[PDB]
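A common beginner's mistake is to predict each chain separately and then try to dock the pieces by hand. The better habit, illustrated here, is to supply every component at once so that their relative placement is modeled jointly.
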Amino acid sequence: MSELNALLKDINGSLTATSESLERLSGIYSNSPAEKVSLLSLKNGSMLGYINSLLMLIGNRLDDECKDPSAMDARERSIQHRVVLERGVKPLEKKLAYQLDKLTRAYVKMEKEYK
Amino acid sequence: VSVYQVSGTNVSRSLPDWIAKKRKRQLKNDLEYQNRVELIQDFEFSEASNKIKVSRDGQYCMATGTYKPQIHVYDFANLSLKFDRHTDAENVDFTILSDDWTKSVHLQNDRSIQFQNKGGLHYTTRIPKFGRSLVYNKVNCDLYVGASGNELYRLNLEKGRFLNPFKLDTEGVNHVSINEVNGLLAAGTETNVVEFWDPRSRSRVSKLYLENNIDNRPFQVTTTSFRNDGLTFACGTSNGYSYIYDLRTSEPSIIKDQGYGFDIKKIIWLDNVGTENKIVTCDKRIAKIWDRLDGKAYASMEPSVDINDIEHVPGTGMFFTANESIPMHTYYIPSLGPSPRWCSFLDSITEELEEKPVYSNYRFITRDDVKKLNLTHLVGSRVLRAYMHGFFINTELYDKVSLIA
Amino acid sequence: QSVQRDASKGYSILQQTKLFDNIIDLRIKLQKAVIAANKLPLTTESWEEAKMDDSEETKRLLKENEKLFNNLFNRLINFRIKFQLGDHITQNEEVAKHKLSKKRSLKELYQETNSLDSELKEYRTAVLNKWSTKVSSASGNAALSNLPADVQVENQLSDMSRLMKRTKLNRRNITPLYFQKDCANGRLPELITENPYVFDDEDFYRVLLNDLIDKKISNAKASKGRKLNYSVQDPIANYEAPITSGYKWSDDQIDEFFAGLLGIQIF
Amino acid sequence: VSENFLEKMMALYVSSHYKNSPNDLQLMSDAPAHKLFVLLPPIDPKDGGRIPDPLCVIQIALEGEISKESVRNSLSRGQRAGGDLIPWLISQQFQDEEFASLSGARIVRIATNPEYASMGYGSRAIELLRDYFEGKFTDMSEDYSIKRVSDKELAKTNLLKDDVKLRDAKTLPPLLLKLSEQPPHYLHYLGVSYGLTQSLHKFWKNNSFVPVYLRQTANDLTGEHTCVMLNVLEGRESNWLVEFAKDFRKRFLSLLSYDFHKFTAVQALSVIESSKKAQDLSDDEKHDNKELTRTHLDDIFSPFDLKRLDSYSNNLLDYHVIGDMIPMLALLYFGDKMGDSVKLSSVQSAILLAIGLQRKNIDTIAKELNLPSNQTIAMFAKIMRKMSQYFRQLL
Amino acid sequence: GISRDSRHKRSATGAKRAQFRKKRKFELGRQPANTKIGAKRIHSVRTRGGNKKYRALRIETGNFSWASEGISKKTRIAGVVYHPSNNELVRTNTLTKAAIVQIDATPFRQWFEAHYGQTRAASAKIESSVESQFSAGRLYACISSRPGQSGRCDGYILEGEELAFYLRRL
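With all components supplied together, the output reads:
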């Protein structure tokens, strides 16, 4: 059994597993006035884009032609998303971490009181 | 922190103590026998010890033995057994009503409460169902007896009358305890709940449901202890988890786990010794001293034999442990506090003392629990250090794997 | 009334925090694809030889791989448009709805990805500037006036070359299929251990995993006495005397304390 | 509503003080540097905005930001300007010009309800007050100045017709402001001045303040010595506090016999321990204690002294004969030149401190510590046995 | 204090008898032998005559007999599960006669494999419940000795109608 055959099967298992789990994540988001934290909303979007850039590297490599085996454009997109998450979002939410925990605790006590 | 075992068997755990007595005649020539020192004469039960407690005056102590069920009373001043008194049954729990040893009450295994005076046994009364704990409320002078059934038994000493029994939602009372600050009574139920009761009236102030995320195994409240501050409250579970609660809030401030998964037999609060923020939790194998605020372990007590009960001498750094061995063990921790007035010269021999010193620091996990947590792949790695039949892991990592599993 | 806004705000915070845990789970499942993908060939000849090893089976797997990949990424872009729509990241609602309805090709999907990244970048600049100003005012740094976070994005994005080298580092020591053959034939211009063609985000993947592990922990008949008798027992009569002093606390404090047992514009 | 709240705040403020004077009310209202903070219970929405009673009230005074030129001029002339007590006092007690320039806030008063005392409200309020000035209270919600009476209004009104009314409710800000709403002033340190007692000293010890100065003469009214104790916020330089704490320690030990001999050994140990916590705050090794060298040991003690030290460890000597070395030994040990080799218990340190530094007799120690005299002597011998062994180890 | 005399009891008619004499040595009782699981502890008791009795404070091993296989093996006692008289003894894991206990199957399992060469076939056939107990690793046994008298905790493996009845009770 060829090495490529084992590899392509592995991608097929990963892609279908991710797709089913993507189906679940989309449903809960669709299920969800409530206003979200703009920083935390951005934190979601940046790392979500990081996965697409990773998947874009998957797409560039999967193509039999491999015109861009390095996947530079996918590389750059992943870099931009990764760069912002680690050093841009993280220090700010560390400053905001104390206040965020207070509100989440504040909601939890109310929910316990209601029940 | 240096811990000294002044009295107690000094043989390996595997070797039984009764052979220490056979070799005794053989080893009498050995110099070590001449040098070894007992603190108080005649501290041994012919088979074993159940419970130990010290007088409030601090000059007397009393203990109970398996067979022939006996009640030794020892005077600290004279370093001698004041007297032995035999009982018709093995004792479960007892309290000293008087400031001295003169007055005491014993709850035996035969469903009967014994009222022992200085002269001798005074009267015997038999409760409807078997009892597991006994506590005395000084203000109202009523004895509440924990029971296997739902109801908590009430006996009033002033009137010599059995008053109505408090009714509990859940069956089985393991431990009962009273806060002298407020009068609140906490009953340790078999189910994972503690019910809090008002003494003046006859009502349940509230019921606290204990929750442990780490283990889903059902657990039973084994012990309850209040502070002289009136604010904070400790619970011992059958899973070896000790919860310290500020009673005002439902959440647990600190959860400390002992390591061997055994029940917490006793919780002692070291307020009087100095550095009030210290607490002792006692299991079958280890009694650990640790800080309420930091949770850090300060000293660990690891006797060669199973512990049945532990007691602290107020204002001093020692602990009397009722064990399954023939001799009961007396321990000394100089850093916590000084020796008493009666062991004035114990200090001089601290170098000659045994100076017993990982096991308490880390988490003991059996081989089966390793299989449950899917940690078999880590066997042989530095993460899991094998001791006896179990692999020791860090407390922080144990919560990590348990939640994932 | 302000409690309701705080509780609802906590709900929104919780919803988002769960969303990270779901998307990181998406990353975890995709991890083996990235490891596997980095092991694939790099040149046309290597791919052709890989197919020549098993022509029929490889062709079938390739067709399924293309179908699953296209279906998955189209759904991702649909989620991206909806996600960036609901969170006000994209302001043109009509255009977003039209994109969702229409079915897109691989090249068209690439156009959306370039776009969706572009609005995200604009939203990125506005959000970082806003919060960085807020924290600066909150911490008194406004009184003082430690770079702005958005400026930090510009600076380290200016340092492209350094971080590209970080990705190119081969920590796992992955060797793509027929790598030696491509090297010998000179089909790999960039190379002519750090390898440009293998992508390594192991530390970033681990850091996210350590963070995910961390949050989970922090969040985590009269005979024998069987019947009761209330009659007086003389021997125990007056066995002890009650203490007249009573509890150290006052009764009012105890009653207050038990009740707390276990739970012009003024403002 | 404001008057009722003002009464409740004054009720708590006065109760904590022994004899409060009416002058303080004018100081609270008009003094610009002062700010008021109140601890309140959770607000039930069902109560319709009814003000809850205050549990803890903190009065702070912003101090510092002093021009270096003024400090040198004031220091040279020996004249103390009004206000900014801590900036002046530490400046004179350390002659450090940079400190006066540092911005800080003095906790003028903390008051807790006597009925609710010891429950932890006083500590909890300080914790947030520390957190607030640290900036942790960032705004979560997506002006508070009042227009003054204009000069045009003043000119247009006559005495007979003048209408003096309470300011319109609309113009006024809210009585109670959320922490997030108002930005905090950038501060370097938090300072407290108080009379040193066991219960009170323990309180700031738990709140991570560091002593820097103790006043030598006892206050006549209270018989108590004033203590100034400081805390550095995160994100701000902490080196200066460590240097002051080290210097205060050396100042503290020497002065124990002079005037502080009255103090209990436990308290002197407590004061030393509070300072020692300050060095633990500093992870830097740049400033560290130096171990006693062999040459320094030789200068301090002669070889006859060391033999005399050894014999009493062997019990071949009496206690009296070794009275010579005790004060130097206490200075060296508490100076930490002894090093990690020889550590002692709290009881042992108290015994060694007093005889070495308070100069108290061994019998006096037994009474103060509620121990037998012979036990104290036995403890003292073991302490020195440890020190004798280290000297052998050094040699 | 323990006495076995019938004089203190009331008559069959219900009459309250009076004391005839002081209590005698020959009609006395001894304290209960609450044997429990643990490291072996036994002490002797001097009884009437020169005869001695052995008191089982603690015992963790016992010689249990597979009657159907006609054998006896010494096995560690795991714990008490059911006692027909009082359930408090079960809760306290007190060992007495007739108590139902759980024992290790290792020696019996090795014995079965050693003779029958099986983990001939007709003889090797055993009751399904007992084989299930082998699979579990712990065997239900009934104590046929009196630990409070002889100091022994011997027993036999439950089988057949006894096993079915005790499983139903469990």
